[PDB]
C-alpha cells in the first residue's frame, strides 16, 4: 500500500496538535540563514495518510506536515541513516555558507545562481529527517 494511515502507524503524531501547548517550529529552518526569527513557520499539524516510497536501493516513509501559514512540508524519514551523515551535513553547511556571496555579486545574481542544498536535520544518531517532495527523481 502506497499510502498508510498516520493514526495506525503513530497515533501520537496524529493527535499532536491537541496535546501540543506551545509553538514548535518546522525543523531545519535555522540551517537556512534567514536573519530574523519571527517569520519561521510553526507546525500546525501532521497530515494523515503518509506515503511509503520504494526507491532503487532502499525504501523510506514520507510524512507531511501542515504549517501554520497553510503550507505543507514533506520530510523523508531515513531510519537507518548511514554513519557518514555528519560529513554530508558539514558539506551541506559549507556550501550553504557560500549562498550569500553568490547574491551580492551582480553576475551570479542576474543568473540567479544559488547552490540548492538539501536540508537534513538529525533527530537521534540513527535517524535523520530530510526534506523530500514528490517529483524528486534520480537519473
Amino acid at each position: 500500500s502506497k499510502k498508510e494511515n498516520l493514526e495506525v502507524l503513530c497515533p501520537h503524531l496524529s493527535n499532536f496538535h491537541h496535546q501540543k501547548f506551545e509553538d514548535i517550529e518546522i525543523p531545519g529552518q535555522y540551517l537556512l540563514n534567514k536573519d530574523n526569527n519571527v517569520h519561521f513557520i510553526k507546525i500546525a499539524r501532521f497530515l494523515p495518510t503518509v506515503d511509503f516510497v520504494r526507491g532503487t536501493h532502499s525504501s523510506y516513509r514520507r510524512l507531511m506536515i501542515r504549517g501554520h501559514d497553510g503550507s505543507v512540508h514533506s520530510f523523508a524519514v531515513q531510519y537507518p541513516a548511514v554513519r557518514h551523515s555528519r560529513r554530508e551535513e558539514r558539506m551541506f553547511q559549507l556550501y550553504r555558507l557560500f549562498n550569500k556571496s553568490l547574491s551580492k555579486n551582480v553576475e551570479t545574481r542576474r543568473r540567479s545562481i544559488q547552490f540548492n542544498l538539501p536540508i537534513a536535520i538529525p533527530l537521534s544518531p540513527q535517524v535523520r529527517i530530510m526534506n523530500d517532495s514528490v517529483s524528486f527523481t534520480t537519473l
Binding site: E7, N15, H39, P48, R66, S112
Partner: protein, 603 residues
Amino acid sequence: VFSYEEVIVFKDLFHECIIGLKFFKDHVSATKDARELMDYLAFMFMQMDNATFNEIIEQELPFVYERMLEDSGLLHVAQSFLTSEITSPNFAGILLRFLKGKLKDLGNVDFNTSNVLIRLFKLSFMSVNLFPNINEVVLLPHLNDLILNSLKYSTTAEEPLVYFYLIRTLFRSIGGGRFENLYRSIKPILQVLLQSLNQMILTARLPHERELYVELCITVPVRLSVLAPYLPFLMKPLVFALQQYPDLVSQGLRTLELCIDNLTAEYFDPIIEPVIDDVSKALFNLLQPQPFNHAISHNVVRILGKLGGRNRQFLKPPTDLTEKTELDIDAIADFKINGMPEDVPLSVTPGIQSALNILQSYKSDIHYRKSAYKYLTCVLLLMTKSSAEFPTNYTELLKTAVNSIKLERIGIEKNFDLEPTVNKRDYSNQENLFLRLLESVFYATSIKELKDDAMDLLNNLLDHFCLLQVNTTLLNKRNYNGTFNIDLKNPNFMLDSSLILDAIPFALSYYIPEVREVGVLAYKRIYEKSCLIYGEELALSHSFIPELAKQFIHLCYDETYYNKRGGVLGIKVLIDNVKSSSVFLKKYQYNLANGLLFVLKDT
C-alpha cells in the same frame, strides 16, 4: 401629551390602517394607491409625540411584521419611517431590538421570511448612513453582538449563507465613520473565522461561497489607514480576490494600494513574502489592453510603477512546471480510417478536462452536459472493457473461490520466473484517471435528466467491482500459506479493484448532499452484493465491508469537516447494517470509538 383613551385610539388607528392595506394588494413592490396610503399613514404619525409613537410602534411591530409576510409592500411603511423622520433613531432602535430577537431563526426559515428579514436589516443599516450626525449611536450597541451571533448561529443553521450575506450588507453599508473603534476588538476572531471558512471549503459550494468569504475578509472597516497588525490574515484572500473573481479585483487592488502607499516597505515586504509569486502572477494577468477594462489595468500599472525594483526582486525561476497529470495523458486506441490500409492509433482522451469542466458547470446547456457525460462514460467503459469478459463457467469458479477461503494451508505451486515491474508514474496516472471518471459518474446523479442512466451504470459498475473483489481476496492468500514464499506466481500489475475504496469515500465527502445519498445507496448495494456472493459469516471479514469500513475510520482523521461528515455517514450506515453479528462491531470497537472521538476533538 395624551390620555390613556387617546393613545388607545391612536393604536387602533395604526392597527386599522395597517389592516386596510389588504384591499390594495396585487389581487419595494407595491401598487400606487397602496403606496400613497402608506405615505399618508407614515406622515400621519410623524407629528405625534415620540414617547407615544414609540410605544404604539413597539406594541404593533410584530403584527406589522407578520403582515409583511403576506403583502411584502408594507416594507414601504418602515422605510418611510426611517428614511425621513424626526423620529428615525427611535424607530431604528425599535426595529433593531425586534430584529435582534428574530435573528436566531433567520437561517431556518423559508425564502419569503428570510427575504423580508434581510430587507428589514438592510433598511435599518441604510438608516444609519442616511443620517450620520443624527443618531448612528443607535447601531453601535448590538453591533459586535450582531457579528458574533451571525457567526455563531450560522453553525447550526439550515441555510448558513444568509448570515454571511448579512455581514456583507453591514460592511457595505458603513465605512467612513467613528464607531469602527469598538469594532477593533472583534477583528482577530472575525478574520480567523473567515480564513478558516475561506480555505476549508476545499469542496466549495460552487456558488458565491468563496466570493462571499473573500469579500468579507478584505473590506473590513478600520479607522487607521492600515487596518491592523492582523494583515497576514488578509494575504491569502488577496490572492483569491485578484486571481479568481473579476468582480472582486477592483476591491483587492485598492487594498494593495493601501498597503503599498504607507507601510514603510520594510514591515510590509516579509508579510507578502509567502504570497508574492501568486500576487505577482495574478497581477500580471490584469495587464490587458483596451477591450479589457482600463480602470483595473491602469490600477495595476500604477501599483507596479510605484514599486520600483520591488515589483521584480522576489521572483525566481519558475517552481510550477506542470508535469502532465491524468487530465493530460493519452489513452490510445486504434481507429479504422477509410483512406488508410490499416487502423491508426490515436488518443481517446483529448477532451477529458474540457468535458469535466462542462459537467461541473451548471450554466452549460443540457445538450452539452449530456454529451460531456456520454464522452466520460465512453472513456470509462473503454478502460473497463478488457475486464468485462467472463468465462463460460464463472459461477462455479466464483463458488469454488469463495468456499476455498475457509480452507487452511492451500498449497502454492512454485515457479521461478520474474514478472515485469509497475512503472509507477503511468500506473498512478491511469489509476487517478479511472478515479476521476468514476467520480464524475457519481456526480452525474446530482443532475435531473442525467440521473437515471447514471444510477443504472453505477449499479452495473458497483456489482462489477463486487465480483472483481473476489480476485483480490483470493490473491491475499498469497500473503499467507507460507510465512516467506518468494517462488510463487502473481498476475503482474493491474488496477486492483480497490479504487472503489477511493470513490465511495469521495461521494460521502462531497459538498452536494444529493450525491452523499448516492454514496450511501452505493454502500447499501455493495453490502447486499457482498453478503450475497460470500455469505454473512465471512463477508464481514473478507469482502469490501471490513475494508471500506477502515476507510470510514480514516475519514474521521482528515483535516476538513467534509471528510469527517463522510466518515460519520459511513459509520452510521455501517452500524445500522451490521448488528446481527457480534464479531465485527466488537472486534472493530476501539478504532471506531477513537474515530468518533477524534471527530469531536478535532473539528
